[PDB]
mmCIF file with all atom_site columns, C-alpha atoms in Angstrom:
data_model
loop_
_atom_site.group_PDB
_atom_site.id
_atom_site.type_symbol
_atom_site.label_atom_id
_atom_site.label_alt_id
_atom_site.label_comp_id
_atom_site.label_asym_id
_atom_site.label_entity_id
_atom_site.label_seq_id
_atom_site.pdbx_PDB_ins_code
_atom_site.Cartn_x
_atom_site.Cartn_y
_atom_site.Cartn_z
_atom_site.occupancy
_atom_site.B_iso_or_equiv
_atom_site.pdbx_formal_charge
_atom_site.auth_seq_id
_atom_site.auth_comp_id
_atom_site.auth_asym_id
_atom_site.auth_atom_id
_atom_site.pdbx_PDB_model_num
ATOM 1   C CA . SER W 1 1   ? 28.868  23.683  -50.267 1.00 0.00 ? 3   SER W CA 1
ATOM 2   C CA . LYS W 1 2   ? 27.165  24.805  -53.221 1.00 0.00 ? 4   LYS W CA 1
ATOM 3   C CA . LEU W 1 3   ? 23.805  22.978  -54.295 1.00 0.00 ? 5   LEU W CA 1
ATOM 4   C CA . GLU W 1 4   ? 21.822  22.640  -50.680 1.00 0.00 ? 6   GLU W CA 1
ATOM 5   C CA . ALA W 1 5   ? 23.328  26.510  -49.815 1.00 0.00 ? 7   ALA W CA 1
ATOM 6   C CA . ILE W 1 6   ? 20.827  27.200  -52.716 1.00 0.00 ? 8   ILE W CA 1
ATOM 7   C CA . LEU W 1 7   ? 18.167  25.261  -50.950 1.00 0.00 ? 9   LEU W CA 1
ATOM 8   C CA . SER W 1 8   ? 19.448  27.251  -47.520 1.00 0.00 ? 10  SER W CA 1
ATOM 9   C CA . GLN W 1 9   ? 19.188  30.317  -49.508 1.00 0.00 ? 11  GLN W CA 1
ATOM 10  C CA . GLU W 1 10  ? 15.945  28.687  -50.786 1.00 0.00 ? 12  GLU W CA 1
ATOM 11  C CA . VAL W 1 11  ? 15.536  28.274  -47.360 1.00 0.00 ? 13  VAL W CA 1
ATOM 12  C CA . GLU W 1 12  ? 16.422  32.068  -45.962 1.00 0.00 ? 14  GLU W CA 1
ATOM 13  C CA . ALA W 1 13  ? 13.619  32.911  -48.760 1.00 0.00 ? 15  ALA W CA 1
ATOM 14  C CA . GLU W 1 14  ? 11.226  31.170  -46.899 1.00 0.00 ? 16  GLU W CA 1
ATOM 15  C CA . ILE W 1 15  ? 12.362  32.811  -43.614 1.00 0.00 ? 17  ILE W CA 1
ATOM 16  C CA . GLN W 1 16  ? 11.562  36.604  -46.437 1.00 0.00 ? 18  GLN W CA 1
ATOM 17  C CA . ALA W 1 17  ? 7.776   35.037  -47.275 1.00 0.00 ? 19  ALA W CA 1
ATOM 18  C CA . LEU W 1 18  ? 7.621   34.551  -43.329 1.00 0.00 ? 20  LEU W CA 1
ATOM 19  C CA . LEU W 1 19  ? 8.357   38.034  -42.790 1.00 0.00 ? 21  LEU W CA 1
ATOM 20  C CA . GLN W 1 20  ? 6.349   39.313  -45.409 1.00 0.00 ? 22  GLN W CA 1
ATOM 21  C CA . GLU W 1 21  ? 3.499   37.581  -44.237 1.00 0.00 ? 23  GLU W CA 1
ATOM 22  C CA . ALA W 1 22  ? 4.019   38.734  -40.606 1.00 0.00 ? 24  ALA W CA 1
ATOM 23  C CA . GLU W 1 23  ? 3.994   42.433  -41.096 1.00 0.00 ? 25  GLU W CA 1
ATOM 24  C CA . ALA W 1 24  ? 1.529   41.637  -43.172 1.00 0.00 ? 26  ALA W CA 1
ATOM 25  C CA . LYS W 1 25  ? -0.303  40.118  -41.259 1.00 0.00 ? 27  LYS W CA 1
ATOM 26  C CA . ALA W 1 26  ? 0.312   42.893  -38.169 1.00 0.00 ? 28  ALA W CA 1
ATOM 27  C CA . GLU W 1 27  ? -0.864  45.871  -40.863 1.00 0.00 ? 29  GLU W CA 1
ATOM 28  C CA . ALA W 1 28  ? -4.024  44.192  -41.895 1.00 0.00 ? 30  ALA W CA 1
ATOM 29  C CA . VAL W 1 29  ? -5.166  42.501  -38.324 1.00 0.00 ? 31  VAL W CA 1
ATOM 30  C CA . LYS W 1 30  ? -3.931  46.528  -37.020 1.00 0.00 ? 32  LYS W CA 1
ATOM 31  C CA . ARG W 1 31  ? -6.103  48.282  -40.241 1.00 0.00 ? 33  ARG W CA 1
ATOM 32  C CA . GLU W 1 32  ? -9.614  46.163  -40.356 1.00 0.00 ? 34  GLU W CA 1
ATOM 33  C CA . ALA W 1 33  ? -9.593  46.226  -36.506 1.00 0.00 ? 35  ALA W CA 1
ATOM 34  C CA . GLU W 1 34  ? -9.362  50.561  -36.860 1.00 0.00 ? 36  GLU W CA 1
ATOM 35  C CA . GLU W 1 35  ? -11.758 50.363  -38.849 1.00 0.00 ? 37  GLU W CA 1
ATOM 36  C CA . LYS W 1 36  ? -13.720 48.711  -35.983 1.00 0.00 ? 38  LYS W CA 1
ATOM 37  C CA . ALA W 1 37  ? -12.447 51.044  -33.437 1.00 0.00 ? 39  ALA W CA 1
ATOM 38  C CA . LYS W 1 38  ? -13.492 53.967  -35.322 1.00 0.00 ? 40  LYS W CA 1
ATOM 39  C CA . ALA W 1 39  ? -17.128 52.114  -36.504 1.00 0.00 ? 41  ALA W CA 1
ATOM 40  C CA . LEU W 1 40  ? -17.716 51.660  -32.742 1.00 0.00 ? 42  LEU W CA 1
ATOM 41  C CA . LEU W 1 41  ? -17.107 54.828  -32.122 1.00 0.00 ? 43  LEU W CA 1
ATOM 42  C CA . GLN W 1 42  ? -19.213 56.887  -34.024 1.00 0.00 ? 44  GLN W CA 1
ATOM 43  C CA . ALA W 1 43  ? -22.213 53.678  -33.806 1.00 0.00 ? 45  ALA W CA 1
ATOM 44  C CA . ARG W 1 44  ? -22.266 54.030  -29.514 1.00 0.00 ? 46  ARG W CA 1
ATOM 45  C CA . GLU W 1 45  ? -21.755 57.795  -29.912 1.00 0.00 ? 47  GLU W CA 1
ATOM 46  C CA . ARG W 1 46  ? -24.458 58.642  -32.592 1.00 0.00 ? 48  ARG W CA 1
ATOM 47  C CA . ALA W 1 47  ? -26.668 55.889  -30.414 1.00 0.00 ? 49  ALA W CA 1
ATOM 48  C CA . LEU W 1 48  ? -26.700 57.593  -27.456 1.00 0.00 ? 50  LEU W CA 1
ATOM 49  C CA . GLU W 1 49  ? -26.512 60.877  -28.952 1.00 0.00 ? 51  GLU W CA 1
ATOM 50  C CA . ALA W 1 50  ? -30.268 59.833  -30.688 1.00 0.00 ? 52  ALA W CA 1
ATOM 51  C CA . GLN W 1 51  ? -31.379 58.626  -27.620 1.00 0.00 ? 53  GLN W CA 1
ATOM 52  C CA . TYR W 1 52  ? -30.458 62.316  -25.401 1.00 0.00 ? 54  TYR W CA 1
ATOM 53  C CA . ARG W 1 53  ? -31.628 64.509  -28.279 1.00 0.00 ? 55  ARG W CA 1
ATOM 54  C CA . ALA W 1 54  ? -34.974 61.931  -28.530 1.00 0.00 ? 56  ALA W CA 1
ATOM 55  C CA . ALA W 1 55  ? -35.231 62.465  -24.955 1.00 0.00 ? 57  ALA W CA 1
ATOM 56  C CA . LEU W 1 56  ? -34.538 66.662  -25.118 1.00 0.00 ? 58  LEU W CA 1
ATOM 57  C CA . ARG W 1 57  ? -37.612 66.613  -27.949 1.00 0.00 ? 59  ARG W CA 1
ATOM 58  C CA . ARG W 1 58  ? -40.412 64.383  -25.969 1.00 0.00 ? 60  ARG W CA 1
ATOM 59  C CA . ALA W 1 59  ? -38.933 66.224  -22.277 1.00 0.00 ? 61  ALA W CA 1
ATOM 60  C CA . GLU W 1 60  ? -39.939 69.842  -23.144 1.00 0.00 ? 62  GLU W CA 1
ATOM 61  C CA . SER W 1 61  ? -42.783 68.199  -25.536 1.00 0.00 ? 63  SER W CA 1
ATOM 62  C CA . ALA W 1 62  ? -43.724 66.929  -22.396 1.00 0.00 ? 64  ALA W CA 1
ATOM 63  C CA . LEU E 2 1   ? 31.262  17.362  -48.470 1.00 0.00 ? 15  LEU E CA 1
ATOM 64  C CA . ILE E 2 2   ? 29.087  15.171  -46.631 1.00 0.00 ? 16  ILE E CA 1
ATOM 65  C CA . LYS E 2 3   ? 29.310  16.678  -43.526 1.00 0.00 ? 17  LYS E CA 1
ATOM 66  C CA . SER E 2 4   ? 28.609  20.382  -45.779 1.00 0.00 ? 18  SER E CA 1
ATOM 67  C CA . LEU E 2 5   ? 25.519  18.717  -46.260 1.00 0.00 ? 19  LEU E CA 1
ATOM 68  C CA . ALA E 2 6   ? 24.617  17.327  -43.076 1.00 0.00 ? 20  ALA E CA 1
ATOM 69  C CA . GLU E 2 7   ? 25.723  20.376  -40.989 1.00 0.00 ? 21  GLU E CA 1
ATOM 70  C CA . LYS E 2 8   ? 23.875  22.796  -43.852 1.00 0.00 ? 22  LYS E CA 1
ATOM 71  C CA . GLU E 2 9   ? 20.291  20.821  -43.322 1.00 0.00 ? 23  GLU E CA 1
ATOM 72  C CA . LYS E 2 10  ? 20.932  21.498  -39.284 1.00 0.00 ? 24  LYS E CA 1
ATOM 73  C CA . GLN E 2 11  ? 21.477  24.798  -39.941 1.00 0.00 ? 25  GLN E CA 1
ATOM 74  C CA . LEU E 2 12  ? 18.228  24.683  -42.283 1.00 0.00 ? 26  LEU E CA 1
ATOM 75  C CA . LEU E 2 13  ? 16.519  23.348  -39.527 1.00 0.00 ? 27  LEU E CA 1
ATOM 76  C CA . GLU E 2 14  ? 17.772  26.350  -37.520 1.00 0.00 ? 28  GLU E CA 1
ATOM 77  C CA . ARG E 2 15  ? 17.147  28.718  -39.736 1.00 0.00 ? 29  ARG E CA 1
ATOM 78  C CA . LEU E 2 16  ? 13.079  27.692  -39.958 1.00 0.00 ? 30  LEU E CA 1
ATOM 79  C CA . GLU E 2 17  ? 13.188  27.988  -36.108 1.00 0.00 ? 31  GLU E CA 1
ATOM 80  C CA . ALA E 2 18  ? 14.742  31.192  -36.231 1.00 0.00 ? 32  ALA E CA 1
ATOM 81  C CA . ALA E 2 19  ? 11.561  31.934  -38.988 1.00 0.00 ? 33  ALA E CA 1
ATOM 82  C CA . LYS E 2 20  ? 9.063   30.113  -36.734 1.00 0.00 ? 34  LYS E CA 1
ATOM 83  C CA . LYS E 2 21  ? 10.698  32.184  -33.988 1.00 0.00 ? 35  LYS E CA 1
ATOM 84  C CA . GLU E 2 22  ? 9.820   35.199  -35.971 1.00 0.00 ? 36  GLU E CA 1
ATOM 85  C CA . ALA E 2 23  ? 6.481   33.911  -36.549 1.00 0.00 ? 37  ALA E CA 1
ATOM 86  C CA . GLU E 2 24  ? 5.054   33.280  -32.781 1.00 0.00 ? 38  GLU E CA 1
ATOM 87  C CA . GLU E 2 25  ? 6.310   37.189  -31.677 1.00 0.00 ? 39  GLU E CA 1
ATOM 88  C CA . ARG E 2 26  ? 4.163   38.581  -34.933 1.00 0.00 ? 40  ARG E CA 1
ATOM 89  C CA . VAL E 2 27  ? 1.337   36.698  -33.501 1.00 0.00 ? 41  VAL E CA 1
ATOM 90  C CA . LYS E 2 28  ? 1.129   37.466  -30.066 1.00 0.00 ? 42  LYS E CA 1
ATOM 91  C CA . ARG E 2 29  ? 2.010   41.104  -30.718 1.00 0.00 ? 43  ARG E CA 1
ATOM 92  C CA . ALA E 2 30  ? -1.454  41.519  -33.289 1.00 0.00 ? 44  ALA E CA 1
ATOM 93  C CA . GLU E 2 31  ? -2.787  39.959  -29.919 1.00 0.00 ? 45  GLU E CA 1
ATOM 94  C CA . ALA E 2 32  ? -1.426  42.315  -27.517 1.00 0.00 ? 46  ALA E CA 1
ATOM 95  C CA . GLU E 2 33  ? -2.745  45.113  -30.302 1.00 0.00 ? 47  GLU E CA 1
ATOM 96  C CA . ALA E 2 34  ? -5.705  44.112  -30.745 1.00 0.00 ? 48  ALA E CA 1
ATOM 97  C CA . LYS E 2 35  ? -6.189  43.686  -26.358 1.00 0.00 ? 49  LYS E CA 1
ATOM 98  C CA . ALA E 2 36  ? -5.250  47.482  -26.174 1.00 0.00 ? 50  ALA E CA 1
ATOM 99  C CA . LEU E 2 37  ? -8.340  48.248  -29.124 1.00 0.00 ? 51  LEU E CA 1
ATOM 100 C CA . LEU E 2 38  ? -10.649 46.397  -26.862 1.00 0.00 ? 52  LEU E CA 1
ATOM 101 C CA . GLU E 2 39  ? -9.511  48.021  -23.971 1.00 0.00 ? 53  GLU E CA 1
ATOM 102 C CA . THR G 3 1   ? 9.152   -24.151 -43.263 1.00 0.00 ? 20  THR G CA 1
ATOM 103 C CA . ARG G 3 2   ? 7.802   -20.192 -44.504 1.00 0.00 ? 21  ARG G CA 1
ATOM 104 C CA . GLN G 3 3   ? 9.587   -19.338 -41.399 1.00 0.00 ? 22  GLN G CA 1
ATOM 105 C CA . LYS G 3 4   ? 13.050  -20.870 -42.348 1.00 0.00 ? 23  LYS G CA 1
ATOM 106 C CA . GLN G 3 5   ? 12.966  -19.796 -46.031 1.00 0.00 ? 24  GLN G CA 1
ATOM 107 C CA . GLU G 3 6   ? 11.482  -16.451 -44.571 1.00 0.00 ? 25  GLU G CA 1
ATOM 108 C CA . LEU G 3 7   ? 14.988  -16.524 -42.336 1.00 0.00 ? 26  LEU G CA 1
ATOM 109 C CA . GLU G 3 8   ? 17.367  -17.554 -44.435 1.00 0.00 ? 27  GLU G CA 1
ATOM 110 C CA . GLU G 3 9   ? 16.426  -15.180 -47.402 1.00 0.00 ? 28  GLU G CA 1
ATOM 111 C CA . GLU G 3 10  ? 16.291  -12.284 -44.839 1.00 0.00 ? 29  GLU G CA 1
ATOM 112 C CA . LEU G 3 11  ? 19.976  -13.470 -43.664 1.00 0.00 ? 30  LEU G CA 1
ATOM 113 C CA . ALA G 3 12  ? 21.366  -13.630 -47.273 1.00 0.00 ? 31  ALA G CA 1
ATOM 114 C CA . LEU G 3 13  ? 19.978  -10.321 -48.126 1.00 0.00 ? 32  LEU G CA 1
ATOM 115 C CA . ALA G 3 14  ? 21.976  -9.438  -45.057 1.00 0.00 ? 33  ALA G CA 1
ATOM 116 C CA . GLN G 3 15  ? 25.108  -10.452 -46.001 1.00 0.00 ? 34  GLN G CA 1
ATOM 117 C CA . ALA G 3 16  ? 25.907  -8.343  -49.560 1.00 0.00 ? 35  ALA G CA 1
ATOM 118 C CA . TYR G 3 17  ? 24.538  -4.525  -47.617 1.00 0.00 ? 36  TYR G CA 1
ATOM 119 C CA . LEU G 3 18  ? 25.265  -5.084  -44.232 1.00 0.00 ? 37  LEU G CA 1
ATOM 120 C CA . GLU G 3 19  ? 28.834  -3.070  -44.617 1.00 0.00 ? 38  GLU G CA 1
ATOM 121 C CA . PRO G 3 20  ? 27.643  -0.939  -47.459 1.00 0.00 ? 39  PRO G CA 1
ATOM 122 C CA . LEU G 3 21  ? 24.761  0.642   -45.700 1.00 0.00 ? 40  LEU G CA 1
ATOM 123 C CA . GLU G 3 22  ? 26.639  0.983   -42.723 1.00 0.00 ? 41  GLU G CA 1
ATOM 124 C CA . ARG G 3 23  ? 29.181  2.850   -44.486 1.00 0.00 ? 42  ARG G CA 1
ATOM 125 C CA . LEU G 3 24  ? 27.122  5.097   -46.365 1.00 0.00 ? 43  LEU G CA 1
ATOM 126 C CA . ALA G 3 25  ? 25.235  5.978   -42.909 1.00 0.00 ? 44  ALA G CA 1
ATOM 127 C CA . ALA G 3 26  ? 27.980  6.555   -41.723 1.00 0.00 ? 45  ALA G CA 1
ATOM 128 C CA . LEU G 3 27  ? 29.415  8.721   -43.921 1.00 0.00 ? 46  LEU G CA 1
ATOM 129 C CA . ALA G 3 28  ? 25.021  10.282  -43.913 1.00 0.00 ? 47  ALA G CA 1
ATOM 130 C CA . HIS G 3 29  ? 25.511  10.646  -40.184 1.00 0.00 ? 48  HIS G CA 1
ATOM 131 C CA . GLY G 3 30  ? 24.182  13.687  -39.650 1.00 0.00 ? 49  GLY G CA 1
ATOM 132 C CA . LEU G 3 31  ? 22.229  13.984  -44.031 1.00 0.00 ? 50  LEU G CA 1
ATOM 133 C CA . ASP G 3 32  ? 20.105  10.899  -44.194 1.00 0.00 ? 51  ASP G CA 1
ATOM 134 C CA . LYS G 3 33  ? 15.469  12.393  -44.527 1.00 0.00 ? 52  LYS G CA 1
ATOM 135 C CA . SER G 3 34  ? 16.396  15.737  -43.234 1.00 0.00 ? 53  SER G CA 1
ATOM 136 C CA . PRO G 3 35  ? 14.363  18.097  -46.054 1.00 0.00 ? 54  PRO G CA 1
ATOM 137 C CA . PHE G 3 36  ? 17.057  19.594  -47.745 1.00 0.00 ? 55  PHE G CA 1
ATOM 138 C CA . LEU G 3 37  ? 18.987  17.117  -50.305 1.00 0.00 ? 56  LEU G CA 1
ATOM 139 C CA . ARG G 3 38  ? 19.038  13.565  -50.740 1.00 0.00 ? 57  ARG G CA 1
ATOM 140 C CA . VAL G 3 39  ? 21.481  11.248  -51.087 1.00 0.00 ? 58  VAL G CA 1
ATOM 141 C CA . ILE G 3 40  ? 21.807  8.956   -53.986 1.00 0.00 ? 59  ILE G CA 1
ATOM 142 C CA . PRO G 3 41  ? 24.215  6.139   -52.839 1.00 0.00 ? 60  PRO G CA 1
ATOM 143 C CA . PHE G 3 42  ? 24.634  3.516   -55.759 1.00 0.00 ? 61  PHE G CA 1
ATOM 144 C CA . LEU G 3 43  ? 27.236  0.146   -55.193 1.00 0.00 ? 62  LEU G CA 1
ATOM 145 C CA . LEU G 3 44  ? 29.217  0.687   -58.469 1.00 0.00 ? 63  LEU G CA 1
ATOM 146 C CA . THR G 3 45  ? 32.402  -0.579  -59.448 1.00 0.00 ? 64  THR G CA 1
ATOM 147 C CA . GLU G 3 46  ? 36.120  0.214   -58.588 1.00 0.00 ? 65  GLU G CA 1
ATOM 148 C CA . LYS G 3 47  ? 37.289  3.627   -59.054 1.00 0.00 ? 66  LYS G CA 1
ATOM 149 C CA . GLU G 3 48  ? 36.142  4.797   -62.107 1.00 0.00 ? 67  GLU G CA 1
ATOM 150 C CA . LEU G 3 49  ? 34.655  7.078   -60.204 1.00 0.00 ? 68  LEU G CA 1
ATOM 151 C CA . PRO G 3 50  ? 34.949  10.214  -62.700 1.00 0.00 ? 69  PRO G CA 1
ATOM 152 C CA . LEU G 3 51  ? 32.909  8.503   -65.828 1.00 0.00 ? 70  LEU G CA 1
ATOM 153 C CA . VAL G 3 52  ? 30.380  8.599   -63.057 1.00 0.00 ? 71  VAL G CA 1
ATOM 154 C CA . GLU G 3 53  ? 31.288  11.769  -61.633 1.00 0.00 ? 72  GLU G CA 1
ATOM 155 C CA . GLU G 3 54  ? 30.741  13.663  -64.664 1.00 0.00 ? 73  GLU G CA 1
ATOM 156 C CA . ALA G 3 55  ? 27.263  14.705  -64.104 1.00 0.00 ? 74  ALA G CA 1
ATOM 157 C CA . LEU G 3 56  ? 28.077  15.377  -61.033 1.00 0.00 ? 75  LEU G CA 1
ATOM 158 C CA . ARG G 3 57  ? 30.583  17.647  -63.072 1.00 0.00 ? 76  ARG G CA 1
ATOM 159 C CA . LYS G 3 58  ? 27.656  19.313  -64.421 1.00 0.00 ? 77  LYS G CA 1
ATOM 160 C CA . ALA G 3 59  ? 26.030  19.546  -61.959 1.00 0.00 ? 78  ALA G CA 1
ATOM 161 C CA . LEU G 3 60  ? 26.713  22.371  -58.772 1.00 0.00 ? 79  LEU G CA 1
ATOM 162 C CA . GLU G 3 61  ? 30.488  22.981  -58.516 1.00 0.00 ? 80  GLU G CA 1
ATOM 163 C CA . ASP G 3 62  ? 30.669  22.702  -54.185 1.00 0.00 ? 81  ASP G CA 1
ATOM 164 C CA . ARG G 3 63  ? 28.471  20.227  -53.636 1.00 0.00 ? 82  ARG G CA 1
ATOM 165 C CA . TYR G 3 64  ? 27.092  17.335  -56.148 1.00 0.00 ? 83  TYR G CA 1
ATOM 166 C CA . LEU G 3 65  ? 29.205  15.131  -53.989 1.00 0.00 ? 84  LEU G CA 1
ATOM 167 C CA . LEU G 3 66  ? 29.393  11.822  -56.093 1.00 0.00 ? 85  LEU G CA 1
ATOM 168 C CA . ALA G 3 67  ? 32.359  9.819   -54.593 1.00 0.00 ? 86  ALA G CA 1
ATOM 169 C CA . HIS G 3 68  ? 33.018  6.573   -52.284 1.00 0.00 ? 87  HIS G CA 1
ATOM 170 C CA . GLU G 3 69  ? 34.256  6.843   -48.772 1.00 0.00 ? 88  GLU G CA 1
ATOM 171 C CA . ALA G 3 70  ? 34.335  3.523   -48.453 1.00 0.00 ? 89  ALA G CA 1
ATOM 172 C CA . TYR G 3 71  ? 33.384  -0.101  -49.278 1.00 0.00 ? 90  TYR G CA 1
ATOM 173 C CA . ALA G 3 72  ? 36.748  -0.440  -51.568 1.00 0.00 ? 91  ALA G CA 1
ATOM 174 C CA . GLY G 3 73  ? 34.885  -4.157  -53.004 1.00 0.00 ? 92  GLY G CA 1
ATOM 175 C CA . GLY G 3 74  ? 31.577  -2.668  -53.880 1.00 0.00 ? 93  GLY G CA 1
ATOM 176 C CA . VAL G 3 75  ? 31.966  0.987   -54.065 1.00 0.00 ? 94  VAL G CA 1
ATOM 177 C CA . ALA G 3 76  ? 28.832  3.096   -52.754 1.00 0.00 ? 95  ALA G CA 1
ATOM 178 C CA . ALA G 3 77  ? 29.351  6.349   -54.441 1.00 0.00 ? 96  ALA G CA 1
ATOM 179 C CA . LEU G 3 78  ? 27.201  8.774   -52.437 1.00 0.00 ? 97  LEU G CA 1
ATOM 180 C CA . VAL G 3 79  ? 26.272  11.816  -54.659 1.00 0.00 ? 98  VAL G CA 1
ATOM 181 C CA . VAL G 3 80  ? 24.420  14.223  -52.984 1.00 0.00 ? 99  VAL G CA 1
ATOM 182 C CA . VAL G 3 81  ? 23.058  17.006  -54.770 1.00 0.00 ? 100 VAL G CA 1
ATOM 183 C CA . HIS G 3 82  ? 19.491  18.468  -53.818 1.00 0.00 ? 101 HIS G CA 1
ATOM 184 C CA . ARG G 3 83  ? 16.274  16.585  -54.242 1.00 0.00 ? 102 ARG G CA 1
ATOM 185 C CA . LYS G 3 84  ? 14.644  17.343  -57.313 1.00 0.00 ? 103 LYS G CA 1
ATOM 186 C CA . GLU G 3 85  ? 17.808  18.683  -58.825 1.00 0.00 ? 104 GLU G CA 1
ATOM 187 C CA . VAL G 3 86  ? 20.241  15.431  -57.578 1.00 0.00 ? 105 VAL G CA 1
ATOM 188 C CA . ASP G 3 87  ? 16.886  13.426  -58.975 1.00 0.00 ? 106 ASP G CA 1
ATOM 189 C CA . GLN G 3 88  ? 18.029  14.757  -62.464 1.00 0.00 ? 107 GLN G CA 1
ATOM 190 C CA . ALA G 3 89  ? 21.815  13.729  -62.108 1.00 0.00 ? 108 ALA G CA 1
ATOM 191 C CA . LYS G 3 90  ? 20.667  10.813  -61.190 1.00 0.00 ? 109 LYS G CA 1
ATOM 192 C CA . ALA G 3 91  ? 18.450  10.100  -64.002 1.00 0.00 ? 110 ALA G CA 1
ATOM 193 C CA . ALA G 3 92  ? 22.009  11.482  -65.627 1.00 0.00 ? 111 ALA G CA 1
ATOM 194 C CA . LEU G 3 93  ? 23.677  9.499   -63.937 1.00 0.00 ? 112 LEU G CA 1
ATOM 195 C CA . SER G 3 94  ? 21.531  6.495   -64.689 1.00 0.00 ? 113 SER G CA 1
ATOM 196 C CA . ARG G 3 95  ? 22.163  7.721   -68.468 1.00 0.00 ? 114 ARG G CA 1
ATOM 197 C CA . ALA G 3 96  ? 26.291  7.091   -67.898 1.00 0.00 ? 115 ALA G CA 1
ATOM 198 C CA . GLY G 3 97  ? 25.287  4.206   -66.080 1.00 0.00 ? 116 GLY G CA 1
ATOM 199 C CA . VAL G 3 98  ? 23.689  3.760   -62.315 1.00 0.00 ? 117 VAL G CA 1
ATOM 200 C CA . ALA G 3 99  ? 22.035  1.905   -60.318 1.00 0.00 ? 118 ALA G CA 1
ATOM 201 C CA . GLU G 3 100 ? 20.847  3.200   -56.711 1.00 0.00 ? 119 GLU G CA 1
#
């Protein structure tokens, strides 16, 4: 059936657009949470490192 | 040739459900990825 | 009196399109309201179905099914092509002379 076979191929193009959005959503979430993983890594590292460093400074000074 | 529209409307609904399965698999995939990120 | 007039009008309206709507729904037993294609049934005259099917031949090849399977008195020429393309084809059939 010609024209509603074309309508069902538009439906397969909607499947195509949905899997495009699926891969795009997976990569977007992975990228933004990778940014946050590295940022929180460096954040807690440098914060506790600065606390450790200032404790060493004030300890040797005292 | 009316039954052709009938049965390919049925399998049109089936193609929508194929896309739906792809969607929900992608969503729980990204959820498990964010779970590994939090861990 | 209002109820009797309404019941008489309902019986008069049901006396004409009982067999034709049932025949169209029987041919269209799976293609009624699924969101792919409309099916414009036009209660037309006897077998001048090619004069209406000229617009369907102007439409898609293995579709734009414009034919009358039953209701030999008033031929329920169902035309099924698409939604928007079948709306344009219904305009073309009305240009050829048709009424759904």
